[model samples]
Target chain A: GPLGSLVAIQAELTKSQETIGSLNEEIEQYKGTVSTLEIEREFYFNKLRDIEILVHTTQDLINEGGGALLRFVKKVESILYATA
Target chain B: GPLGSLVAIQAELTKSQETIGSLNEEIEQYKGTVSTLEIEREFYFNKLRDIEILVHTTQDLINEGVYKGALLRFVKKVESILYATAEGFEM
Candidate 1:
């Protein structure tokens, strides 16, 4: 009877070891997936930074000249009307 | 001898179970880390999309006439020159 109990315990131990091995493999896979995602995140962050710079520069240029051009147009219209 | 072998096997079984338990805990921890990284990746992707839109809109505005007004200013200068020439002829 004791030998039978030992045999059962041995079988359970084999199953547990297999479970541990598979879980280790899964952990390794997840580690790789996480690493890839981290790289992708950095890539997107760099792209975002570049786009932000472009947007800011473009906005500044538009603001700088847009208002000036409007004012110039108004001034010219007023002068031409007065002369007329 | 058989009893002694049983005792050794029982000890080995205990060690194996412990290892399995630890591995399960480690896997759970890794799962949490992966989830957090996935969320971070999504956040960055969203930010990138928004910035891309902003960049495209800014480019469009610029193309429409932000810097083209410099050329318009030259045209105004030419108009003044032509007006002056016509007035000289009238005089």
Candidate 2:
């Protein structure tokens, strides 16, 4: 009977909405995770830039007068000790 | 009247499927975005770890005699501080 068909469709509609609600919640959670990940990614990139600069600058110093300074300090130490 | 009700319900069922199909497509697209985001997150984390180690080792070298405390204040300020926002999706 047509009445029977109406009941079935209404039940299906209710079920469909329930499914939609569930999917919506899942998507919401995923979006939250994505947002957190994006923030973390940005933070990491910032760290990378700063760290790269530091490493480069340090390397340059070591290349230039870093070893020379060490030798100079050693020379001073030997002079002070010999005089003592 | 009952026949009319049946016709109406049939039409609604058809419309419901259409809506469901649309939602499914949206979900699939979102999943793809999620997968890409995850891969990118992994890559960034790996880079961050390597850089952190490099920075730490350099700091130790700087602590030893020749360049003691030269970059201490500088590296201390390179903190992981950030903020982000995302617009909620509507279905």
Candidate 3:
């Protein structure tokens, strides 16, 4: 059991509430990070799948040259940017 | 400051401790999620970014066999990423 005076115990309760507030905030930030990471993970995964399909289905046509060739290039670029 | 007897404050302290206990547990869950999600996200991003670079930098001199060779690998690699052990088949 706690063995503190009323004032001291009150002060600690105040501090505990503050800690709870801070921890709640930290928890929220991490939730945001996890969801955002999942979004980015799925985003890149879909892009790779797109490339996989394009390469499988159109590589022959694109390799022969001309419009579809340029189209594939533009499409791939549209999905990826910088390094992310 | 509290306006109660010692025993009453003691009860509050004990309850507060329990609250803190579960709050910290929730924090632990989020930390684990962030750690793995961040790493997994970057791992795929780098792989995709590399392929995209090759895509736009085309010299207009590649061939059907070239596409065949590249597509073979791309298909396999995409399968690799998407499969990842099959997770028995993931969630």
Checking candidate 3 for backbone clashes, the offending pairs are B86-B89
TM-score of chain B of each: 0.69, 0.66, 0.53
Q: In terms of DockQ, which candidate is stronger, 1 or 3?
A: 1
In model 2, state the lDDT of residue B79. Answer: 26
**Predicted complex 1: DockQ:** 0.25
Highest-TM-score candidate: 1
> What is the per-residue lDDT of model 2 for residues A42-64, given as tens digits with 9 covering 90 to 100?
76556555545544555566575
Q: Please identify model 2 stretches exceeding 4 Å from their true place.
A: A51-84, B60-91
DockQ of 2: 0.20
CA lDDT, candidate 1, residue A57? 47
**Candidate 3: deviation at residue B33, Å?**
1.1
lDDT of 1: 0.60
lDDT of each residue in B14-51, candidate 1, tens digit only? 88888888887888888898899877666654543443
Give the alpha carbon lDDT tens digit for every residue of B1-91 in model 3. 2334776876888888888899999989888888888687676657555554553344232433344344344435544554442332234
Task: Give the C-alpha miss distance for residue A3 in model 1, angstroms.
Answer: 2.2
Better of 1 and 3 by lDDT: 3
lDDT by residue for model 3 over A27-77, one digit each (tens)? Answer: 888888787777666766675666556555555556654354445445554
